[PDB]
Design a protein around this ligand. Structure first.
Ligand SMILES: NS(=O)(=O)c1ccc(NCc2ccc(B(O)O)cc2)cc1
Ligand code: NI
Ligand SMILES: [Zn+2]
Length: 262
């Protein structure tokens, strides 16, 4: 009998191939999905999302070769998420983005089939499991907040991020990044869609409660061009621009997307 045991976004190792190392891709709970709003059953019993970033302590920003991420002190309930569909408190650990080679693509989730120019993921782990390592092993371990990005009007709360991207151009670079306020990345409304799903990068584990916000945030084509100057490659290796680091929509199968808003 068969016996089973690096990935990227290129043609040879991109999403179409991930299922071969990570057969959970063949599952029923993969992300991202297309959000079909005809079929998204509004639900009144979904509560306001309580985004409590009162005391958020950013630490580092870094280029991991797939994306950039900003990490937070997650030792205390300094930045948490509760309400919406979540049973309990989920503490923020990091945020990262996915984006395109051009403005017409970059988002992971789609809405009635439209792709936005980038998507922001805020990654939270369920405090009752004690840390992110134990949480990552559970069906209700993680909660990701997804925020769409469209081009036009510059986003101010993002300039602090964008001003340092040239210090972390290549894979493995990092910097101290303190006193960054994540609330300056939220849009005004917090109406959301929710469904059970997965990480969108390997290992593609199916323990994620997805919360996608209806309202995108806007950013200047100058800001998102800064995203596009990052490299997938390391210093001294041939240049390969960090673009199109998004997984395409996966089939919803027997799941239903719920809405918080009519
Ligand atoms: N793209 S996503 O679905 O938001 C996604 C979220 C999380 C993960 N991996 C899990 C994970 C946990 C901790 C850190 B860290 O730097 O402290 C990074 C990644 C993989 C994909
Ligand atoms: Ni065996
Ligand atoms: Zn992500």
């Amino acid at each position: 009998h068969h016996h089973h045991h690096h990935w990227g976004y290129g043609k040879h190792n991109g999403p179409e191939h991930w299922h071969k190392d990570f057969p959970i891709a063949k599952g029923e709970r993969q992300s991202p999905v297309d959000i079909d709003t005809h079929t998204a059953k509004y639900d009144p019993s979904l509560k306001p999302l309580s985004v409590s970033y009162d005391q958020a302590t950013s630490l580092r920003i870094l280029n991991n070769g797939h994306s950039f991420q900003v990490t937070f002190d997650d030792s205390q309930d300094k930045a948490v998420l509760k309400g919406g569909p979540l049973d309990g408190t989920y503490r923020l650990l990091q945020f990262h983005f996915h984006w395109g080679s051009l403005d017409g693509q970059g988002s992971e989730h789609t809405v009635d089939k439209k792709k936005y120019a980038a998507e922001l993921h805020l990654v939270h782990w369920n405090t009752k499991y004690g840390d992110v390592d134990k949480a990552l092993q559970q069906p209700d371990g993680l909660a990701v907040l997804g925020i769409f990005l469209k081009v036009g009007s510059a986003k101010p709360g993002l300039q602090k991020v964008v001003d340092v991207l040239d210090s972390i151009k290549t894979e493995g670079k990092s910097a101290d990044f303190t006193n960054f306020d994540p609330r300056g990345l939220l849009p005004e409304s917090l109406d959301y869609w929710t469904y059970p799903g997965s990480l969108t990068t390997p290992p593609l584990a199916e323990g994620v409660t997805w919360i996608v916000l209806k309202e995108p945030i806007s950013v200047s084509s100058e800001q998102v061009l800064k995203f596009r100057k990052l490299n997938f490659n390391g210093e001294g290796e041939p240049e390969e621009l960090m673009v199109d680091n998004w997984r395409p929509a996966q089939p919803l199968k027997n799941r239903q997307i719920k809405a918080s808003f009519k």
